[PDB]
Structures are given as structure tokens and as C-alpha cells.
Design a protein around this nucleic acid. Structure first.
Lengths: 169, 165, 373, 375, 368
DNA sequence: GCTAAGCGCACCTAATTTCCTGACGGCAATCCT
């Protein structure tokens, strides 16, 4: 379980990581099967008992898209990549935008309700769920660009289209 | 809105010498020259008495001086961030366009008593491109309403939508 | 060597320079309103004067195609001249060439038509046109007022190359500012209809605006730059300097002179020779106030004399001694009633002032410099 | 020891410095609009002046290869010089390098020795060229203005190493702010078509903009830094100080002076000698309002004298004294009427002021410092 | 015992501080844009001020091995200094290390150049670096250091390197609305060409504003940092006052020679720090009468009167000195007669605050 | 004790170029052995 309160350089804390144990379980042991998937995740680092959570996912077993479920298997990478992108800048060891790091949890919690439709990809996909970040992005961009000017509006609009581009592994 | 359209009409009915004494008064206040104050009284006091929605003193003085300087006709649907902003599509986007954009950007950070000079250079850019019409009524009721944030917001994204066509 | 002319000229109530509305041109000097005559107005009045007529070579015209066309043959304007000038970099907006072409009049116009008369093809005759235009350079008013022609590069073919078209100006003219606080005045005019076919109306009613002022004019001529610009014709440069001195005094701006006649000759002219330029406009930071026993011109000349004495005693008294000549009409106004010898010669005639200036420039008599052009 | 020159100069209606749109350069010095001349314009006018001609020798160009070809004579080698410069870290776009090079004019001969040398290769010749360019800091104007030279590292040979190419500036120029409420006027110029034609209109219609203002110019020269950057040439440093004073007083920026011949000399020069740099712009925080019985220049000097007396009484009464010389043309405009003892010396001549300044510096006649020039 | 300095300083058009894009630093205060000068810039300008050469005693460098090697005419020891520093905890030419200059010179020369053991030599170097906290600039600005525990050996222990800062500096915010301005500069080619174009075109950014500056010195913490030598503490306080009054940040000063001096300094002695920036929550607008420094001083005097008539302790009276050059700008123009000791000389002000501090004169304390 | 009509212009042209920097610097602990 990828849960820790310590938001590091390479980690961005969002929410319960139901997305993580999906590629291996839906490939090797259990595969696609009609039923409910109960996940229990006890996050730990040596003797540090971090957090325990559980989740229930509905499932029918409507095939399995390989690369999309693999992309879904690590959402924390794309979330950290979106957090690390600065307002204006090119350096890579910066904290990026820390105000985004407080609105990623709510959008992740809103996404995690329809986790079955996310996983089987009936009408929910990466593009359809990451547009739930839109209103939080607008109202964070209002804070980060608190000017009523043309350039502030254009840079706010560039802040709007920020979304977690998926990655292959 | 009443009180503003008749103000624009009376400004447009002003003759050449009156516009000249307004032109010479540009750049300073109206406490150092008599005929500027007499003209402001003549063009304000009866229209202030007749209507409750008369514009505020300093914005009316600013628009009077700017109309004397530039003399563009009143036409509906020809506000500043449409005309400039359509002008901002024909420039070089990497160097010249950011500079004219910063010239228009400066306008959002002045009070009412130094505002006439950045407006003057913006209207000079307008005059260099043969622009005959300006929404004078629109400019003055959005300038008298300058105390709020939504008015500058709709100003700005009007410039944006004029830019994206 | 720099020849410097400071002129004090009181004008009648008039409107010599005006903006788009018709208000007389005004500046603010010393925090107060001053009447202004612009420098290009004085420059074109000098250029188009009767005394500078003999040295007026040059066109500065955006209708150069018609100037090429003026042969009896009419088969080179609509096709040949327009296309060649378009290829050179001057587009046409309804049969005029947009760019103003400042260039020498006689010989360069004569040479351009032999380019535009048959054979040798396009993109090579355009090169001859560019070569003859960039190499004109030989005219007194071009030498004084400079030159430009920078054509557009988008329409021009890449096979035509341009030389350096920049000619450095040898003349610096300051804007003629008033010596006192300007009083803008409004004449109310009524145009009366001659036929009484209706009630006693008028016709057109309006305002004209005018002012009266005592102007300080400043001119600076670089002798070596003039010599270099005419390619070493020293007699031409001396003739140009003398005719400029005559035309600055005897010719007024050509504004509303039909209704406001202000042909007032200058009643004080100070001509100095120095290697560095100064302008005695800071004398009139304090505007001249008229006291009962005197006149505005006398007080303006007194302030000018005070400032000239202060500048001369406070900036240089050795090495270069700065030779100056003071001209007043029949010595009507002395240059200061205080201690004398501020000007090396109090000349009571303009032609003698021209002769003295040309003598100090190197002994050119006025007679044989007139034969230069 | 630090030399401060504070100049009050009333200029005629002119556009000395303008931005990209032709507007005169304006600033907001305390909430109100003032007319501004940037320090780069004044620095260029001082540097390219007749009074500063002898102390030249600094060239700032992207066409160093053209200078090398001109010095080498009729031996071509322009492409060879361009190859050496490209290997040095100066990438050529079409004919000039991509970055500006500031260097002493006398060392170009040394460069022409390295480029024309056919025995040496490309990397060693580049190293010698870099050594000559980095060491070419013996010009007075380079010592006044400073330098930075950072070559292109990507297009640089690995066997090319640069020494320290940074010299500190010994001159600080402030932006000349107007003492009063500036306001520009729109000159409605027109261009006359000399041919009659049929339109009877015009050739061109446009908007020039001009302004008239009384400017406060500030110059600061670090004496020991100027001596150090000239490696101990005290006569050269005195020559630079004197020619700088003549250039600051007598030379004006050459911006549209053909149309606005504003060659007005300063109406007041306060030359002070002190250890720390101080400035009197705060005198004109309140804009000068002209009264009828006084003058804009007179009131400007009066306000300057008020602030100078206040600063001297509240800031400059220690064991270390501040000596200032006040220059007006023939004592036309004196200092503050309420004190009349503010300046240590009320000099009424520019040459006498320069002589007094040089006598204070170490004792320096104008004649024997005019005989030591770098070119 | 807290010494509080509130200064009002009007500046010429200048760019003292810039961000990544070369723009003057701006901050939102009271809902409007204000020109900002960073506190670190003011601290650096004070530490590198001409009134600090006799008092500067600290170096914050990562090139410590260069400093240790520089005290050796022929004793070439640079790789061994780098190795002992690398084992000390720095990981490389190191991280930034702040301590005294004479201390690093003398002690590092007598410690690391000695031919001796290796780990305990690193422990000795670490003890020397940590214990070298006797410098008044280190005492004012403050310092703590943490070395990398990975590259450090397990046999090297570090003592407490935490130096509590006795100086608090606020960011200088403008009393009026920020006025960002653009300067369009070119760079002319000194050799001619056939085209007449500049060598470079750019846009500098500058702003002229009336800044409010705020400093706070903790006297008990200052004498705890510099130990019992109170003479050096008084010298540090006087040098701070002189440097803050008489030094400007070294931004683009070669192009913008803005060396204006402050028109008003309030030095107050109280046990609780007060920020008077809330006086300028409402932006200062210019009027026909008076100027910006007068309006800002009037607003500041109004707020000072409101604070003294508001937050007031009978057990601890509030007391402060007002500064104006030759009494040019009075504080309480209308009614607020709070400044008891309007002082028209900087040396007199320094003497008065040193006398309130205790039995110290400026000439007596200028010897430590 | 203090008047009142009528009359208030529009056409022409509004420009071109070219240059726009580079390198350097980016921290560590401490939050289960």
C-alpha cells in the first residue's frame, strides 16, 4: 500500500490506493470474475504502522484492457508528476504547486466511488475521471493568479488544462 | 443608462475651441486653470442636477480630456478590449505582442488620478491603426464602476475572446 | 566648427502652426504655457523660401513614378515604373508609391529614366534604380535635413540588394518657444450668406484660434558635416550657410497668413561660432513680464544678454574664445545695457552679418559662393 | 574617496529618450508622472563625446571578426577568424557573433597576430584569442562601465579555458527624473508631398510626442575602483574624472536633436567628495509648483538646497567632512538663500571647478593629466 | 528588551530586487499590489555595508577547503582538506557552511594540516566549525547546520549548531500601490554596419516606491549569542543602526543609482514587536498639498497614536525616538505629541539609543 | 424696470528594418529499533 502522510519529493499523498493492486490480481490470481472485490491495504515501512483501509469494488468481468489497466495500476506516479509541475519554471527538484496537493485528495475521493466503472472501462476512463479536477483547478487558479488582468486570465487557463498524462509502466 | 448618454452627446456637440481648452488642460488638474473648471461646471452641474445617475467627477473629467485629445465617434459594440485585441492579432507574437499586451496590462493597476496617461498611449495605438469608433458610453460606465473585481474580470475575458477569434 | 543662430522675433496675433483641430501649437516650458512653432515648419519654410530657392535640390516625393513618367513617351508609367518600384520595395496604394523618396533632383531623375527605357530585364534594372537612389546624396537640403529610404522587404525579390541610404543631417533646429506666458485667444467668426432668400441668418458660424508671442529660435549648422555631405564642395557649403542665414531671418512660417499676416522681421540675431552646441532657451525659464516703461522685445533681449553673459563667463573664457556677432535693425536694440564686448561686432545690417559670418568661415565673399549652384 | 556630481539641467522641449512606441520615457517617482532619461543614454552620450574622445579604446561589438580582418590587412583570413571565434564560444549567426564582446581596442592587433599565425592549430589559437580578449580591460570606458563575457558553452571546444572576464563598474549613473509634474504633448506632424498631384492631401500623418522638463542627473565615480581597474594609472584616472565632468556638463543625449535642438547646459552642478554614495532625488518627492514671482529652475535649486542642508545637518556632521563645490554659470543661480554658506566653494566657472576637483583629488593640473591618454 | 526600527524610505526609479524573470518583487497586502524588497537582500546589504568592515566576522561558504589552503605558502593540502570535510558530513564543493573567518583560518590550519589520525581529525574539524559562533553577524542573522548522515562516518558526532537569530527583518512593502514599469533598452554596436541594428534588445523592469522597513533586535538574545562581551553588542547595535540608515541594497545600482536616504526613522524600546505596516493597509494616494513622505508619515503617526492610545501598558511605557533630517518632516503634525525626542542627527540618535541601552557611548564601544 | 432668431463645413493621406545574451549556483533531519 502506497500510503504515507510524508509527502516526499517522489510521492504525493492523495487517498486510499485502490488503483495499485489491480494489474497483478486481474492478470494472475482471480482474473476477471463477476463479484465484489474487497481490498485491504496495511501500509507499512519497516515497523512503522502507517494506515489501514479497505474498499469494495463492483465487478462483472467485462474482458481486460491490458495497457489501460497497467496505467491505472500506478496512478501515484502521474499524480506526483502533476504535483511537481511548477507554475512557471523548469527545475525538477522543486515542490511544484503545493496547493494542488490539497485538492488532489478530494478529486481522488470523488473518483474512487466509481472504481468498478473505472476498472472495467464501460463509460468511465482516465479522461472522463480527471475532468473532475476542473472546478478545484479553477478555484485554485483564482488563488494563485489573483489578478483581474489579461495575462493572469491566460495563465489561469493554462493552469486549467493541467491533468495527469498517463505513463506506460 | 441615463446621465451618461447625454454626457457623451454634450461632449460630442462641443466645438473646436472648447476642445482646445480641454486639450491644453490635459496632464494636470482643474484647480490651476479657470476655463477648464468653468467648462467642467457647465458640462457637469446641470446634468448632475437633472439626473441622479451622473458619472463621478474625476472619471468624467478624464473622459472629457481623452475625448478632447482623441475625438473618436460613439458607436455601440466598440469597446476597448475588442478593438485592441483585434489589433493584438496582427502583431509579432513573440516580442511586439507581449509589449503591447503589457501596455494594456498596466491599466488594471492604476487609481483614477493617474489613469489618463496609460489610456492615452493605448488610444494612441488605436489612432495609429485608423480606429474611428469607440464605445465612449461603455468605457465611462465601466470606468466609473472601477471599484469592483467582476467588472475588470469581464473586461479581461472580453479581451481574451477578442483574441481567440 | 559650428555656426549657431539665436533669433528673437515678435509676431503679430496669428496662427502659424496648428494641430488637427486648429488650435495654435503650444508647449509647456518652465511650468507655464508657451506658444510653439515646430522645427519642421521652420525647416520647410526655409527650404521653400525665395532665398534658399537657388539651392533647392531634392523632391522627397511618394509620387516618384510620375516623376519618371514625365517624358513625352507615355509607355513607362503604368507598367514599367510601377512594377520596378514595387520590386524595389515600395508598394502602390492607388498609383502612389507609399514610401517618400528623399533624393537628389536633377541628375538622379535624369539617370533613372535611362534605367526605365527598354531592355536589360527586371530584377537587374531594379538594381540600377536602387543604386541611383542610394547614391543621390548630393543636394544642400539633403545635407542639412538628412535622408531616409528603407524599403519593404516582403514584396521585394531577394536578388535586389540595397546600399547604405542614411545621410547624416548637418542642421539642428529647435522648436520656436515663446518668451512669455502664452495667451490663447478665440476669434468668433460668422460667414454671411450674400443672398437674402430667408430671414437674417448667417451661414457658417465657428471659432478660429490665434495667439501672439515673442519667439526664440535656435539653429545649429555643423560645418564639417556639411563639407562631408556635399563630398567636399566647400563653396556649396558656404553658399548653403549664407542662404540659410538669410532665409531664417527673411522668411516666416506659411500658416494662416492670408487672414493673420505676421510678416514680422526678427529684431535680434546672435550668430556665434563654436565647436560645441548651446541653446540660450534657459533665459526664458522665467517668462517675460511687461513693465510700463519698456516693451516685451527689450526685456526679452535683456534676459537673453544676461544669460549669454552668464554662460560665457561660466563655461569658457580661454582657448576657444567663441566669436559672436550681434545684429539688430539699425542697432535699434543693443545687446544689453550693461558692460559691453559680449559680442565681437554689433552689426547693423543683415547682409554685413552674412559677410562677416562667411569671412569667419574662411574668407568666402558672398559674390562667388553664389555661383556654386 | 567617492565623487558625486548632482546636476540640475533645464532642457528645451525634446524627446531625448524614448521607448519602442516613440513615447518619451516616463517614470512614477512618488505616485506622479516624471520625465525620465535612462542612464544608458547618458552613458552613451558621455562615452561618445568630443570631450571624452581621448579616453576611448573600448569596443563593444558582435563583429570582432570584421575588426580582425581590417587589422590584418589584405590577407583575408575572415573565415579563419570566424572559425576561431566559433570554437571560442561566440556562435556566428550570419556574419556576426550571437553575443556582444567588450574589449580594449589596442589588443585587436594581438588577435590579428593569433589569427594570421598559420603555424598554430585551431584549439591553441582559440585559447590564445580567449586569453587576449579576457585581458583586454585597459580602456578607460571599460573601467568606467564594467564588463561581462560569458561564451557559448555548448558550441565551445573542450580545450578552451577562460579566465575571469569580469571587471566591476567604477561609474554609477541614475535615471534623470524631472523635478515637476511631467506631461507630454502630442506633436501632430505631417509630411509634405512636394509633387502637386491631384489629392492635395499629405504624404504621411503621425504623432510624435515631446516633453520639456528640469532634470536631476546623478553621477557617482569610485576613485579607488577606477584606479584599480586602470591598474594604478593615477594620471589616467584624473584624466577620466576631468573629461567625465566636461562630458557630463557639455554633452547632451543625441535623441532626435535634429528636430529638438535642446543643447541647454546645466543650471547647477554640485560636486561632492564623500565616502558613501548619497542622492538628492528625495528633494523632488513633492513636485515643483511654479509661482509667478519665482522660477522653475530657481525653485528647483531652492528645494535642492533645502534637502541638502537638511541632509548635511542630520546625516553629515561627523569627524569626516563632506566638501562640495557648487557651480553656476557666473554665479547666476546661487544656493539656498536662508543659509548662503552650504557649499564649501561657490565656483563660477566650469574649468575652475574642474581644476578645484583635480586639486582636491591628489593635486592634478589639467595640462599634465591631459598628456596621459589611453587609445 | 526589544529594539524596534521603523523606517520610511522613498526611492528613485530602481530595481533593487528581482525574481527569476527580472521583475521587481511584488506582494499582495491589503488586497493590492505592493512593491517588495526581500529581507535577505536588506540583511546582505547591512552585512556588506561600509559601516560593517570593522564588525564583519563571518563567512558562509561551501569552498571551505580553499580558505584552509589559502593559509599555506608551500604546504599544498587541498585533497586532504576536501576528504576531511567530506567525512565531516558534506557531500561532494560542499553544502553551505557558516562560521567565523579567523577561526576557520587559524584552527583549521592547526587541526587538519597536522599529520595525525583521520576520523578524530574530522571530529576536531566538526567541533571547530560548530563552536565557531563568536561573530556578531552570525549572532544577528542566525544559523543552524545539518550535515549529511549518509556520507558522514559513524564515529563523528556533531554538537549543537543552532544559533538563534537575534534579528528579525520584514520585507520592505510599499506604502502605496505598486507601479511596475518597463524600460526598453537596446545595445548599440560600436562598429558600423550596413543595417544599423542594435546588438541586443531587452526589457528591464523597475519601480519607484516609498518603502516601509521594519527591524527588530532582541537585546537579551544578542548578549546571549555574543556572550558576556556587551561592548561588542553595543558596537553591533550601533553598526546596525548606521548601516540600516546609510546603506541601500546593491541591485541594479550601476544602471539605477538610487542611493536616497530615509526621511524617517522611529527607534522604539519595547518588550513586544509592533508592525506599523497596518497603517498602510489603505494605500497612500497623492494629493495637491503635501508629498508622499509627508502623507505616509502622517498615516504612520495616526497609527502610532492609535496603537499607543490602544495597546498600552502602564507597567511598560512605550518610548521611541523620531528621525528627520534637520526636523524637515515632523511626526505629529496635528495632535499626536508622542515622539518626545525628535532628533535631527544620526550620531545623536545612535548616542541616545546607546545611552538608553546603558552606560555606552559610541566612541567607547567602537573598540571591540 | 433686464430681448430674441437664425445660422455652426468636410476631403485627402497615416511608413518602412533589424537586431532580441550567455554560464553558474538548486541544500540537509526528522518524524520505529
Amino acid at each position: 500500500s502506497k500510503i504515507k502522510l510524508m509527502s516526499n519529493d517522489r510521492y504525493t499523498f492523495a487517498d486510499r490506493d485502490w488503483y495499485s493492486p489491480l494489474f497483478s490480481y486481474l492478470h494472475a490470481e482471480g482474473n476477471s470474475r463477476q463479484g465484489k472485490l474487497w481490498l485491504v491495504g496495511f501500509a507499512s515501512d519497516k515497523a512503522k504502522s502507517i494506515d489501514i483501509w479497505d474498499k469494495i469494488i463492483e465487478l462483472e468481468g467485462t474482458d481486460t484492457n491490458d495497457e489501460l489497466l497497467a496505467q491505472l495500476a500506478n496512478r501515484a506516479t502521474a499524480l506526483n508528476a502533476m504535483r511537481k509541475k511548477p507554475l512557471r519554471g523548469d527545475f525538477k527538484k522543486s515542490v511544484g504547486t503545493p496547493q494542488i496537493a490539497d485538492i488532489i485528495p478530494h478529486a481522488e475521493n470523488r473518483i474512487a466511488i466509481n472504481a468498478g466503472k473505472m476498472t472495467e472501462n464501460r463509460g468511465y476512463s482516465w479522461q472522463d475521471a480527471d475532468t473532475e479536477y476542473g472546478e478545484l483547478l479553477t478555484k485554485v487558479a483564482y488563488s494563485l493568479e489573483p489578478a483581474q488582468t489579461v495575462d493572469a486570465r491566460l495563465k489561469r487557463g493554462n493552469f486549467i488544462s493541467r491533468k495527469p498524462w498517463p505513463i506506460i509502466p | 443608462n441615463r446621465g451618461t448618454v447625454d454626457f457623451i452627446a454634450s461632449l460630442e456637440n462641443l466645438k473646436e475651441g472648447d476642445l482646445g481648452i480641454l486639450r491644453k488642460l490635459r496632464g494636470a488638474r482643474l484647480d490651476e486653470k479657470l476655463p477648464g473648471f468653468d467648462l467642467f461646471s457647465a458640462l457637469w452641474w446641470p446634468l448632475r442636477q437633472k439626473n441622479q445617475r451622473a458619472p463621478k467627477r474625476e472619471v468624467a473629467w478624464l473622459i472629457a480630456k481623452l475625448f478632447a485629445e482623441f475625438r473618436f465617434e460613439q458607436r455601440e459594440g466598440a469597446t476597448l478590449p475588442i478593438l485592441m485585441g483585434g489589433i493584438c492579432r496582427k502583431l509579432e507574437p513573440k516580442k511586439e505582442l507581449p509589449r503591447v499586451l503589457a501596455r494594456f496590462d498596466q491599466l488594471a493597476s492604476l487609481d483614477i488620478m493617474q489613469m489618463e496617461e496609460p489610456l492615452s498611449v493605448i488610444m494612441g495605438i488605436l489612432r495609429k491603426h485608423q480606429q474611428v469608433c469607440l464605445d465612449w458610453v461603455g468605457l465611462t460606465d465601466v470606468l466609473s464602476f472601477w471599484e469592483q473585481e467582476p467588472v475588470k474580470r469581464e473586461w479581461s475575458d472580453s479581451f481574451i475572446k477578442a483574441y481567440k477569434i | 566648427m559650428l555656426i549657431e543662430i539665436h533669433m528673437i522675433q515678435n509676431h503679430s496675433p496669428a496662427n502659424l502652426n496648428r494641430d488637427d483641430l486648429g488650435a495654435p501649437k503650444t508647449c509647456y516650458f518652465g511650468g507655464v504655457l508657451r506658444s510653439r512653432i515646430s522645427s519642421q515648419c521652420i525647416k520647410r519654410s526655409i527650404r521653400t523660401s525665395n532665398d534658399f530657392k537657388a539651392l533647392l535640390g531634392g523632391v522627397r516625393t511618394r509620387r516618384l513614378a510620375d516623376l519618371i513618367q514625365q517624358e513625352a513617351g507615355e509607355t513607362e508609367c503604368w507598367k514599367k515604373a510601377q512594377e520596378i518600384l514595387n520590386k524595389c520595395g515600395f508598394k502602390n496604394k492607388d498609383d502612389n508609391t507609399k514610401m517618400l523618396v528623399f533624393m537628389s533632383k536633377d541628375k538622379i531623375k535624369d539617370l533613372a529614366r535611362i534605367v526605365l527605357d527598354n531592355s536589360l530585364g527586371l530584377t537587374e534594372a531594379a538594381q540600377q534604380v536602387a543604386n541611383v537612389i542610394a547614391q543621390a546624396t548630393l543636394a544642400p537640403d539633403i545635407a542639412l535635413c538628412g535622408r531616409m529610404l528603407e524599403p519593404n522587404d516582403k514584396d521585394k525579390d531577394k536578388k535586389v540588394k540595397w546600399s547604405n541610404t542614411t545621410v547624416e543631417a548637418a542642421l539642428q533646429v529647435a522648436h520656436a518657444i515663446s518668451t512669455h506666458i502664452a495667451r490663447p485667444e478665440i476669434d468668433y467668426f460668422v460667414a454671411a450668406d450674400d443672398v437674402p432668400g430667408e430671414d437674417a441668418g448667417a451661414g457658417h458660424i465657428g471659432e478660429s484660434m490665434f495667439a501672439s508671442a515673442c519667439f526664440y529660435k535656435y539653429f545649429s549648422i555643423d560645418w564639417e558635416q556639411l563639407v562631408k555631405n556635399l563630398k567636399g564642395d566647400t563653396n556649396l557649403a558656404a553658399h548653403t550657410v549664407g542662404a540659410f542665414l538669410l532665409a531664417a531671418a527673411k522668411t516666416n512660417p506659411s500658416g494662416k497668413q492670408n487672414s493673420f499676416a505676421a510678416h514680422n522681421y526678427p529684431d535680434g540675431i546672435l550668430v556665434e561660432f563654436k565647436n560645441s552646441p548651446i541653446s540660450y532657451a534657459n533665459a526664458f525659464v522665467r517668462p517675460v513680464s511687461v513693465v510700463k516703461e519698456s516693451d516685451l522685445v527689450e526685456q526679452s533681449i535683456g534676459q537673453l544678454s544676461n544669460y549669454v553673459n552668464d554662460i560665457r563667463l561660466g563655461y569658457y573664457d580661454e582657448q576657444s574664445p567663441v566669436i559672436g556677432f550681434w545684429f539688430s535693425p539699425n542697432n535699434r536694440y543693443p545687446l544689453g545695457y550693461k558692460h559691453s564686448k559680449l559680442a565681437s561686432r554689433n552689426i547693423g545690417n543683415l547682409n554685413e552679418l552674412v559677410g562677416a559670418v562667411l569671412d569667419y568661415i574662411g574668407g568666402f565673399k558672398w559674390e562667388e559662393v553664389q555661383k556654386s549652384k
